[PDB]
């Protein structure tokens, strides 16, 4: 999610930092017997608690499972999900800056934040940053996403596109019934860029999750368009 066998997720200034920590403590509480939340655990990084560096005791980090472990040369893609990349409490100025960062969000329903794709054609990593995904359009999005699945010179990993789509359909089913709204959240995609399919699809960024009434339509929208783009990549 950020730094550091775990990964250290740096918590953001209040109110964002306390919100993400509340969320994690909520789904991972020991007395949690809410089936929706317990089911949610499947799609998240494992959470091991908080951590401060001895020099900054007021500086808080989440201890998170590093899901790119188990993988030899992992390919990773970060995808923000939804039609808004802002929560309902954002001011007008925030909303304009978020909308102006990617105006097609409203229509495509997801945004590609970054990729790192292992090329066996070169034993090197190809990287895409913020501005690649902020440039894809209705017309280029289908190729844009398929860039992530070009594993070297040979296979364009259909088996990986297929695994991806099954796991995320399962997140589609959870969100098809729930009590929580996710703004500016993302999915993390990992697959194996060589060998030692097997893929990871995890939900990750949680500083803007809110109690809901009720079904999160912006998120089901974005999920649905992403399964669309991934289905047609499979054909």
Author numbering: -14 to -11, 71 to 262, 377 to 415
What did the authors write?
As an essential gene in mammalian development with ubiquitous expression in all eukaryotes, IPMK has important functions at the nexus of many important signaling, metabolic and regulatory pathways, exerting influence through both kinase-dependent and independent roles. The kinase activity of IPMK is a well-characterized node connecting inositol polyphosphate to lipid phosphoinositide signaling, and is critical for AKT activation, Wnt signaling, PLC-mediated IP3/Calcium signaling, nuclear receptor transcriptional activation, mRNA export, and many other roles. All crystal structures of IPK-superfamily kinases have a consensus ATP-grasp fold structurally conserved between family members. However, there are two intrinsically disordered domains in several members of the superfamily: an N-terminal disordered domain and an “internal loop” within the kinase-domain that occurs between S279 and Q373 in human IPMK.
To examine if removal of the two IPMK disordered domains alters IPMK kinetic properties on the PIP2 substrate, the entire disordered N-terminus of human IPMK at D70 with a 6X Histidine tag was replaced, and the kinase-domain internal loop was replaced with a small synthetic Glycine-Serine linker [S279-(GGGGS)2-C373]. Further, removal of the disordered domains from IPMK does not dramatically alter IPMK structure, as a 2.5 Å crystal structure of ΔIPMK maintains all the consensus features of the IPK-superfamily fold. Nevertheless, we were able to solve the structure of human apo-ΔIPMK by molecular replacement using the yeast IPMK as the search model. As with all other members of this superfamily, ΔIPMK has an N-terminal domain consisting of β-sheets 1–3 and α-helix 1, the IP-binding loop consisting of α-helix 2, and a C-terminal domain consisting of the remaining β-sheets 4–7 and α-helices 1, 3, 4, 5 and 6. Two ΔIPMK monomers are in each asymmetric unit of the P21212 space group crystals, with a crystallographic dimerization interface mediated mainly through contacts in the IP-binding helix. We have not observed ΔIPMK to exist as a dimer in size exclusion chromatography, suggesting the dimer in our asymmetric unit is crystallographic. Three of the 6 amino acids of the His-tag in ΔIPMK were weakly ordered in a position next to the β1 strand where nucleotide is predicted to be, if the nucleotide were not lost during cryopreservation. Indeed, ΔIPMK has a KM for ATP of 300 μM, while the ATP KM for wild type IPMK is 61 μM, demonstrating ΔIPMK has a 4.9-fold increased KM for ATP than wild type, despite ΔIPMK having an identical KM and 1.8-fold increased kcat for the PIP2 kinase substrate. Taken together, these crystallographic observations and enzyme kinetic data suggest the native N-terminal sequences of human IPMK can form a previously uncharacterized and structurally conserved ATP clamp, stabilizing ATP binding to IPMK.
